[PDB]
Design a protein around this ligand. Structure first.
Ligand code: HEC
Ligand code: HEC
Ligand code: HEC
Ligand code: HEC
Ligand code: HEC
Ligand code: HEC
Ligand SMILES: CCCCCCCc1cc(O)c2ccccc2[n+]1[O-]
Ligand SMILES: CCCCCCCc1cc(O)c2ccccc2[n+]1[O-]
Lengths: 146, 51, 144, 50
């Protein structure tokens, strides 16, 4: 009776958390800040359009992911409100690292027989455009604000 | 916190000034585009040299 | 009292979800010796780091639960009371859920090209994604 | 949680600006510059296989 209500609250609670966890990984959530449009567009246009941002930008491990999401999350809200972002938005050391790790996560088998890890620091030092099509003309990526 | 997808289109913002079809006086654009104008004025710098 | 109930609730769903995922991966699938050839050819291939049901089950949660129980039930039966043949071939249904999952992960490669209309399934070109069927027998299979 | 597969694979449907009896190659160039650039590779006339 009474504990069955409790159980029913339990399943809802975790279902909601899990859904929210996932939603807060995808392109529509990330791009609800106009400052993230260039990266949104370039993502939707690229080969990696049908995976989430956090499939590259967060660790895949559940225990490592939760804190990373809340730290980057908190830091991004702060930058978009009280802080003054520059003309250049660049990935910090930490995120270069979780990304390259996730390169390895999905493209291991292509690379098993080859010291591609030792050549350049990051995969993207060859696969340059996986970094949000940086080489393409400005007009294919960016406009002014409204 | 937010919920619709980005646009592939890249739509440039649209404007409707108060200016007439033949307006050519620079300072007439000022009150409606202060940030670009401000930037335009930075051409007045005439002391900085490169290599 | 209801805090106990909640604590049971989270455990229940956590367990179910874990078990759902585990019953998707290579070590669960290959706990039947009949599924070794596919296991090996999988672990050797480009797709080694994704689960079997990432290809072999629907991705949709509502469609996946029943598919998993039906195929599961039918596989247990075939491994016990039924007699499997010399040839293990994918049935129509599974050719279909697989090809749909080809589409699921490689859409962007194919957006501008009527690749879907040429052959019936992707694997009619990408022949070896079908568990390396072309390679010599000795690279896939041994006796029991 | 939701899917991230926000671009779904669809068979391309085309509608050109060209008239129904157009035959001129150069009229096809503006709407399909990629296939065209590929078509132009047929101008290569120096390579022998075996
Ligand atoms: C969705 C989950 C994401 C992801 C994957 C990223 N963001 Fe943003 N972000 C915002 C602002 C104002 C900045 C500039 C900060 C600065 O000047 O350094 C950023 C920066 C980033 C980066 C680069 C820096 C870093 O190493 O973290 C990356 C990789 C990044 N973001 C990814 C603003 C916002 C948001 C407003 C609240 C939201 C929401 C997001 N970003 C969402 C995401
Ligand atoms: C883990 C989740 C899996 C997956 C993805 C598959 N199997 Fe099995 N399977 C078993 C037996 C005895 C057969 C042969 C029966 C017959 O000859 O008809 C099969 C066959 C298959 C197929 C082909 C049939 C189809 O559905 O298209 C496929 C795609 C397949 N398996 C995938 C037996 C077992 C097990 C023993 C109980 C277990 C465990 C698995 N299979 C695991 C998996
Ligand atoms: C996608 C990349 C796949 C993964 C990952 C795994 N398999 Fe596979 N499987 C795939 C295809 C394209 C086919 C054939 C489809 C067709 O139309 O013929 C199969 C087939 C099987 C079979 C039997 C039929 C056969 O062709 O051999 C089995 C028993 C099977 N798949 C199971 C299976 C297991 C256990 C896997 C993990 C080790 C696995 N598959 C991975 C595509 C993909
Ligand atoms: C394929 C992996 C991948 C995916 C998916 C991806 N990005 Fe990126 N992202 C990168 C790479 C690579 C960099 C640059 C890393 C470096 O500086 O070494 C980067 C950097 C960034 C940057 C700032 C650095 C820069 O070069 O602009 C932002 C902001 C960002 N990502 C956000 C996002 C958002 C939002 C999405 C979802 C729409 C997304 N990313 C999807 C790979 C990805
Ligand atoms: C859930 C995701 C997923 C599914 C399902 C999937 N792939 Fe892949 N595919 C990937 C990833 C990730 C890689 C890259 C791994 C690597 O680089 O080693 C890849 C690589 C490939 C490659 C290059 C490697 C190779 O073996 O040829 C081909 C071709 C390919 N996929 C086609 C297919 C086809 C055909 C199917 C259907 C049977 C399929 N994919 C199913 C995700 C998937
Ligand atoms: C969790 C999944 C995942 C992650 C993370 C990931 N990839 Fe991919 N990647 C894929 C899949 C699946 C494809 C095939 C896309 C298709 O066929 O539409 C792909 C495609 C590619 C391609 C072919 C398209 C292109 O842009 O050249 C390259 C190169 C590539 N990945 C390299 C990388 C690099 C570098 C990283 C790290 C930043 C990375 N991948 C991260 C899954 C992933
Ligand atoms: C308590 C956890 C729930 C909060 C979710 C925050 C979502 C979030 C927000 C961001 O701005 C991010 C920026 C870079 C990488 C990951 C990011 N995540 O995950
Ligand atoms: C926790 C409930 C899970 C029920 C166990 C089913 C596992 C299972 C077993 C199989 O033999 C399969 C064969 C082809 C495709 C999927 C299969 N699944 O999911």
């Amino acid at each position: 009776k009474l504990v069955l209500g409790g159980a029913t609250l339990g399943v809802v609670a975790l279902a909601t958390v899990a859904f929210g966890m996932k939603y807060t990984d995808q392109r529509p959530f990330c791009t609800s800040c106009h400052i993230m449009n260039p990266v949104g567009v370039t993502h939707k246009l690229s080969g990696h359009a049908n995976i989430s941002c956090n499939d590259c930008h967060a660790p895949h491990n559940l225990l490592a992911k939760l804190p990373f999401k809340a730290i980057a999350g908190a830091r991004d809200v702060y930058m978009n409100t009280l802080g003054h972002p520059g003309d250049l938005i660049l990935a910090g050391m930490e995120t270069k690292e979780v990304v390259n790790a996730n390169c390895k996560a999905c493209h291991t088998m292509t690379n098993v027989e080859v010291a591609s890890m030792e050549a350049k620091k990051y995969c993207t030092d060859c696969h340059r455009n996986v970094q949000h099509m940086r080489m393409k003309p400005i007009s294919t990526r960016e406009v002014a604000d409204e | 916190a937010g919920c619709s997808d980005v646009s592939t289109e890249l739509k440039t913002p649209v404007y409707k000034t108060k200016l007439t079809a033949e307006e050519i006086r620079n300072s007439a654009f000022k009150p409606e585009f202060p940030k670009q104008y401000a930037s335009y004025e930075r051409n007045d710098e005439t002391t900085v040299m490169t290599e």
